Ligand binder design. Structure first.
Ligand code: BEF
Ligand SMILES: [Mg+2]
Lengths: 128, 16
């Protein structure tokens, strides 16, 4: 992907955001903004310019699944890559994220390799 | 009864 690709990292705790932001930096992506929940995330996405969303599941105001679903139903964001990074690992939830159109799913705690791997596969699709 | 938890590999099968 283009190194100027703009990312939105959504989590209600800074730890995940820092980890993800730093791994993104290691891969060469510095254009990264953060949000603290689904609503906060939607306010920034509506501002436009975003090219990739990575977000937690358990968050107040609007969780990750609901965020994913609104993004997928929005004519201006419907194809936005949405990679879930969350501690949530129960099967019924994994299946739900998949049925709602999640672009990928990484379980917390995750290694640097796992994130780069998942990210790169989504990136390949963005190129075709 | 216990939960149905999926590993990262099982998750990769349908999401990654
Ligand atoms: F709060 Be996230 F789902 F880890
Ligand atoms: Mg073509």
């Amino acid at each position: 992907a283009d190194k100027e690709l703009k990312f939105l990292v959504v989590d209600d705790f800074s730890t995940m955001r820092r980890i993800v932001r730093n791994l993104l930096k290691e891969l060469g992506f510095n254009n990264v903004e953060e949000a603290e929940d689904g609503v906060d995330a939607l306010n920034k996405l509506q501002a436009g310019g975003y090219g990739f969303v990575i977000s937690d599941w358990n968050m107040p105001n609007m969780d990750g699944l609901e965020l994913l679903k609104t993004i997928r139903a929005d004519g201006a964001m419907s194809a936005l890559p949405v990679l879930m990074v969350t501690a949530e690992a129960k099967k019924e939830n994994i299946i739900a994220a998949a049925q709602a159109g999640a672009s990928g799913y990484v379980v917390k705690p995750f290694t640097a390799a796992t994130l780069e791997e998942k990210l790169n596969k989504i990136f390949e699709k963005l190129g075709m | 009864m216990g939960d149905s938890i999926l590993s990262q590999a099982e998750i990769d099968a349908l999401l990654n």
